[PDB]
mmCIF file of N, CA and C in Angstrom:
data_model
loop_
_atom_site.group_PDB
_atom_site.id
_atom_site.type_symbol
_atom_site.label_atom_id
_atom_site.label_comp_id
_atom_site.label_asym_id
_atom_site.label_seq_id
_atom_site.Cartn_x
_atom_site.Cartn_y
_atom_site.Cartn_z
ATOM 1 N N UNK A 1332 47.762 -4.169 41.511
ATOM 2 C CA UNK A 1332 47.656 -5.528 41.997
ATOM 3 C C UNK A 1332 48.974 -6.266 41.848
ATOM 4 N N UNK A 1333 50.055 -5.534 41.599
ATOM 5 C CA UNK A 1333 51.360 -6.157 41.406
ATOM 6 C C UNK A 1333 51.805 -6.993 42.620
ATOM 7 N N UNK A 1334 51.470 -6.515 43.814
ATOM 8 C CA UNK A 1334 51.833 -7.199 45.045
ATOM 9 C C UNK A 1334 51.125 -8.554 45.148
ATOM 10 N N UNK A 1335 50.049 -8.740 44.378
ATOM 11 C CA UNK A 1335 49.294 -10.001 44.406
ATOM 12 C C UNK A 1335 49.659 -10.943 43.253
ATOM 13 N N UNK A 1336 50.606 -10.513 42.427
ATOM 14 C CA UNK A 1336 50.885 -11.147 41.138
ATOM 15 C C UNK A 1336 52.160 -11.985 41.226
ATOM 16 N N UNK A 1337 52.111 -13.199 40.691
ATOM 17 C CA UNK A 1337 53.272 -14.084 40.718
ATOM 18 C C UNK A 1337 53.559 -14.597 39.307
ATOM 19 N N UNK A 1338 54.819 -14.523 38.884
ATOM 20 C CA UNK A 1338 55.214 -15.059 37.584
ATOM 21 C C UNK A 1338 55.752 -16.465 37.765
ATOM 22 N N UNK A 1339 55.178 -17.404 37.028
ATOM 23 C CA UNK A 1339 55.534 -18.819 37.157
ATOM 24 C C UNK A 1339 56.287 -19.279 35.914
ATOM 25 N N UNK A 1340 57.386 -20.002 36.113
ATOM 26 C CA UNK A 1340 58.119 -20.611 35.008
ATOM 27 C C UNK A 1340 58.388 -22.075 35.345
ATOM 28 N N UNK A 1341 58.771 -22.856 34.341
ATOM 29 C CA UNK A 1341 59.126 -24.255 34.540
ATOM 30 C C UNK A 1341 57.994 -25.255 34.407
ATOM 31 N N UNK A 1342 56.815 -24.807 33.981
ATOM 32 C CA UNK A 1342 55.686 -25.725 33.840
ATOM 33 C C UNK A 1342 55.996 -26.850 32.855
ATOM 34 N N UNK A 1343 55.444 -28.030 33.106
ATOM 35 C CA UNK A 1343 55.532 -29.110 32.128
ATOM 36 C C UNK A 1343 54.710 -28.765 30.886
ATOM 37 N N UNK A 1344 55.082 -29.362 29.759
ATOM 38 C CA UNK A 1344 54.375 -29.157 28.500
ATOM 39 C C UNK A 1344 52.884 -29.434 28.621
ATOM 40 N N UNK A 1345 52.527 -30.332 29.530
ATOM 41 C CA UNK A 1345 51.158 -30.808 29.636
ATOM 42 C C UNK A 1345 50.331 -30.012 30.633
ATOM 43 N N UNK A 1346 50.964 -29.101 31.364
ATOM 44 C CA UNK A 1346 50.250 -28.444 32.453
ATOM 45 C C UNK A 1346 49.398 -27.291 31.957
ATOM 46 N N UNK A 1347 48.117 -27.314 32.312
ATOM 47 C CA UNK A 1347 47.197 -26.255 31.906
ATOM 48 C C UNK A 1347 46.790 -25.404 33.112
ATOM 49 N N UNK A 1348 46.029 -24.342 32.861
ATOM 50 C CA UNK A 1348 45.769 -23.323 33.878
ATOM 51 C C UNK A 1348 45.099 -23.867 35.139
ATOM 52 N N UNK A 1349 44.112 -24.744 34.983
ATOM 53 C CA UNK A 1349 43.343 -25.158 36.156
ATOM 54 C C UNK A 1349 44.172 -26.063 37.062
ATOM 55 N N UNK A 1350 45.071 -26.829 36.457
ATOM 56 C CA UNK A 1350 46.014 -27.644 37.217
ATOM 57 C C UNK A 1350 46.989 -26.777 38.015
ATOM 58 N N UNK A 1351 47.483 -25.716 37.389
ATOM 59 C CA UNK A 1351 48.346 -24.764 38.079
ATOM 60 C C UNK A 1351 47.584 -24.078 39.196
ATOM 61 N N UNK A 1352 46.350 -23.690 38.906
ATOM 62 C CA UNK A 1352 45.525 -23.035 39.907
ATOM 63 C C UNK A 1352 45.362 -23.929 41.135
ATOM 64 N N UNK A 1353 45.048 -25.203 40.919
ATOM 65 C CA UNK A 1353 44.870 -26.115 42.044
ATOM 66 C C UNK A 1353 46.149 -26.264 42.860
ATOM 67 N N UNK A 1354 47.287 -26.316 42.178
ATOM 68 C CA UNK A 1354 48.574 -26.400 42.855
ATOM 69 C C UNK A 1354 48.781 -25.182 43.768
ATOM 70 N N UNK A 1355 48.461 -24.004 43.250
ATOM 71 C CA UNK A 1355 48.727 -22.757 43.960
ATOM 72 C C UNK A 1355 47.675 -22.438 45.018
ATOM 73 N N UNK A 1356 46.559 -23.161 44.997
ATOM 74 C CA UNK A 1356 45.547 -22.981 46.036
ATOM 75 C C UNK A 1356 46.104 -23.396 47.392
ATOM 76 N N UNK A 1357 47.248 -24.078 47.385
ATOM 77 C CA UNK A 1357 47.944 -24.382 48.628
ATOM 78 C C UNK A 1357 48.343 -23.102 49.352
ATOM 79 N N UNK A 1358 48.501 -22.020 48.594
ATOM 80 C CA UNK A 1358 48.952 -20.752 49.160
ATOM 81 C C UNK A 1358 47.804 -19.777 49.381
ATOM 82 N N UNK A 1359 46.729 -19.926 48.619
ATOM 83 C CA UNK A 1359 45.602 -19.026 48.777
ATOM 84 C C UNK A 1359 44.664 -19.027 47.595
ATOM 85 N N UNK A 1360 43.704 -18.105 47.602
ATOM 86 C CA UNK A 1360 42.704 -18.049 46.544
ATOM 87 C C UNK A 1360 43.264 -17.367 45.296
ATOM 88 N N UNK A 1361 43.023 -17.970 44.142
ATOM 89 C CA UNK A 1361 43.565 -17.476 42.882
ATOM 90 C C UNK A 1361 42.495 -16.738 42.079
ATOM 91 N N UNK A 1362 42.800 -15.515 41.652
ATOM 92 C CA UNK A 1362 41.841 -14.701 40.903
ATOM 93 C C UNK A 1362 42.162 -14.576 39.410
ATOM 94 N N UNK A 1363 43.393 -14.885 39.033
ATOM 95 C CA UNK A 1363 43.809 -14.841 37.626
ATOM 96 C C UNK A 1363 44.816 -15.958 37.451
ATOM 97 N N UNK A 1364 44.664 -16.752 36.403
ATOM 98 C CA UNK A 1364 45.623 -17.819 36.161
ATOM 99 C C UNK A 1364 45.610 -18.138 34.681
ATOM 100 N N UNK A 1365 46.649 -17.705 33.982
ATOM 101 C CA UNK A 1365 46.731 -17.942 32.549
ATOM 102 C C UNK A 1365 48.090 -18.502 32.174
ATOM 103 N N UNK A 1366 48.078 -19.489 31.287
ATOM 104 C CA UNK A 1366 49.298 -20.140 30.838
ATOM 105 C C UNK A 1366 49.757 -19.529 29.530
ATOM 106 N N UNK A 1367 51.067 -19.362 29.398
ATOM 107 C CA UNK A 1367 51.673 -18.768 28.213
ATOM 108 C C UNK A 1367 52.718 -19.712 27.633
ATOM 109 N N UNK A 1368 53.420 -19.268 26.597
ATOM 110 C CA UNK A 1368 54.376 -20.144 25.919
ATOM 111 C C UNK A 1368 55.561 -20.459 26.815
ATOM 112 N N UNK A 1369 56.253 -21.548 26.503
ATOM 113 C CA UNK A 1369 57.530 -21.833 27.128
ATOM 114 C C UNK A 1369 57.423 -22.244 28.583
ATOM 115 N N UNK A 1370 56.290 -22.836 28.954
ATOM 116 C CA UNK A 1370 56.107 -23.372 30.296
ATOM 117 C C UNK A 1370 55.955 -22.280 31.347
ATOM 118 N N UNK A 1371 55.328 -21.178 30.965
ATOM 119 C CA UNK A 1371 55.205 -20.040 31.861
ATOM 120 C C UNK A 1371 53.745 -19.647 32.095
ATOM 121 N N UNK A 1372 53.505 -18.911 33.173
ATOM 122 C CA UNK A 1372 52.156 -18.465 33.505
ATOM 123 C C UNK A 1372 52.212 -17.207 34.340
ATOM 124 N N UNK A 1373 51.085 -16.520 34.434
ATOM 125 C CA UNK A 1373 50.954 -15.397 35.360
ATOM 126 C C UNK A 1373 49.736 -15.672 36.212
ATOM 127 N N UNK A 1374 49.894 -15.501 37.515
ATOM 128 C CA UNK A 1374 48.835 -15.777 38.455
ATOM 129 C C UNK A 1374 48.656 -14.572 39.362
ATOM 130 N N UNK A 1375 47.419 -14.303 39.763
ATOM 131 C CA UNK A 1375 47.169 -13.322 40.802
ATOM 132 C C UNK A 1375 46.351 -13.970 41.894
ATOM 133 N N UNK A 1376 46.631 -13.581 43.127
ATOM 134 C CA UNK A 1376 45.907 -14.094 44.277
ATOM 135 C C UNK A 1376 45.034 -12.979 44.819
ATOM 136 N N UNK A 1377 44.088 -13.348 45.675
ATOM 137 C CA UNK A 1377 43.210 -12.376 46.308
ATOM 138 C C UNK A 1377 43.980 -11.384 47.167
ATOM 139 N N UNK A 1378 44.983 -11.858 47.896
ATOM 140 C CA UNK A 1378 45.720 -10.963 48.786
ATOM 141 C C UNK A 1378 47.219 -10.981 48.520
ATOM 142 N N UNK A 1379 47.908 -9.899 48.902
ATOM 143 C CA UNK A 1379 49.371 -9.934 48.851
ATOM 144 C C UNK A 1379 49.937 -11.040 49.737
ATOM 145 N N UNK A 1380 49.269 -11.346 50.847
ATOM 146 C CA UNK A 1380 49.723 -12.420 51.738
ATOM 147 C C UNK A 1380 49.744 -13.771 51.034
ATOM 148 N N UNK A 1381 48.753 -14.011 50.178
ATOM 149 C CA UNK A 1381 48.677 -15.272 49.442
ATOM 150 C C UNK A 1381 49.832 -15.374 48.459
ATOM 151 N N UNK A 1382 50.118 -14.275 47.766
ATOM 152 C CA UNK A 1382 51.258 -14.229 46.848
ATOM 153 C C UNK A 1382 52.576 -14.474 47.575
ATOM 154 N N UNK A 1383 52.716 -13.862 48.745
ATOM 155 C CA UNK A 1383 53.918 -14.016 49.565
ATOM 156 C C UNK A 1383 54.103 -15.459 50.020
ATOM 157 N N UNK A 1384 53.004 -16.078 50.430
ATOM 158 C CA UNK A 1384 53.008 -17.475 50.848
ATOM 159 C C UNK A 1384 53.402 -18.402 49.696
ATOM 160 N N UNK A 1385 52.919 -18.111 48.489
ATOM 161 C CA UNK A 1385 53.243 -18.948 47.338
ATOM 162 C C UNK A 1385 54.735 -18.900 47.042
ATOM 163 N N UNK A 1386 55.289 -17.699 46.934
ATOM 164 C CA UNK A 1386 56.712 -17.560 46.671
ATOM 165 C C UNK A 1386 57.556 -18.142 47.817
ATOM 166 N N UNK A 1387 57.113 -17.919 49.048
ATOM 167 C CA UNK A 1387 57.858 -18.370 50.217
ATOM 168 C C UNK A 1387 57.836 -19.897 50.322
ATOM 169 N N UNK A 1388 56.648 -20.475 50.228
ATOM 170 C CA UNK A 1388 56.483 -21.882 50.578
ATOM 171 C C UNK A 1388 56.341 -22.832 49.397
ATOM 172 N N UNK A 1389 56.139 -22.310 48.190
ATOM 173 C CA UNK A 1389 55.929 -23.202 47.049
ATOM 174 C C UNK A 1389 57.027 -23.062 45.999
ATOM 175 N N UNK A 1390 58.081 -22.331 46.339
ATOM 176 C CA UNK A 1390 59.216 -22.179 45.443
ATOM 177 C C UNK A 1390 59.820 -23.541 45.138
ATOM 178 N N UNK A 1391 60.125 -23.775 43.867
ATOM 179 C CA UNK A 1391 60.764 -25.012 43.437
ATOM 180 C C UNK A 1391 59.968 -26.266 43.806
ATOM 181 N N UNK A 1392 58.650 -26.131 43.911
ATOM 182 C CA UNK A 1392 57.799 -27.293 44.111
ATOM 183 C C UNK A 1392 57.515 -27.986 42.781
ATOM 184 N N UNK A 1393 57.333 -29.295 42.824
ATOM 185 C CA UNK A 1393 57.079 -30.047 41.605
ATOM 186 C C UNK A 1393 55.591 -30.118 41.287
ATOM 187 N N UNK A 1394 55.256 -29.858 40.029
ATOM 188 C CA UNK A 1394 53.889 -30.008 39.545
ATOM 189 C C UNK A 1394 53.905 -30.817 38.257
ATOM 190 N N UNK A 1395 53.192 -31.938 38.261
ATOM 191 C CA UNK A 1395 53.178 -32.817 37.100
ATOM 192 C C UNK A 1395 54.593 -33.096 36.606
ATOM 193 N N UNK A 1396 55.485 -33.353 37.562
ATOM 194 C CA UNK A 1396 56.830 -33.815 37.275
ATOM 195 C C UNK A 1396 57.824 -32.726 36.931
ATOM 196 N N UNK A 1397 57.387 -31.465 36.982
ATOM 197 C CA UNK A 1397 58.247 -30.334 36.649
ATOM 198 C C UNK A 1397 58.403 -29.385 37.832
ATOM 199 N N UNK A 1398 59.631 -28.925 38.067
ATOM 200 C CA UNK A 1398 59.918 -28.000 39.160
ATOM 201 C C UNK A 1398 59.606 -26.575 38.740
ATOM 202 N N UNK A 1399 58.805 -25.884 39.543
ATOM 203 C CA UNK A 1399 58.382 -24.525 39.198
ATOM 204 C C UNK A 1399 59.282 -23.483 39.831
ATOM 205 N N UNK A 1400 59.488 -22.384 39.108
ATOM 206 C CA UNK A 1400 60.207 -21.232 39.623
ATOM 207 C C UNK A 1400 59.195 -20.096 39.738
ATOM 208 N N UNK A 1401 59.136 -19.459 40.909
ATOM 209 C CA UNK A 1401 58.174 -18.382 41.169
ATOM 210 C C UNK A 1401 58.891 -17.079 41.446
ATOM 211 N N UNK A 1402 58.358 -15.981 40.919
ATOM 212 C CA UNK A 1402 58.954 -14.672 41.165
ATOM 213 C C UNK A 1402 57.898 -13.565 41.243
#
């Protein structure tokens, strides 16, 4: 499922998983969304297309005042 997986960095201190999930629903359906230390998270989407759309169209987007980096 690596093709469906996106690594997120740059989250604000206050941002939790469901908020990130809602942000990324702009790109597609989210099947895994967990927040980790240092403003980071790992997300998986239903399809590789959704992951591609997130990286393509949501790169450096602001969430709760913080710019996200996607890879």
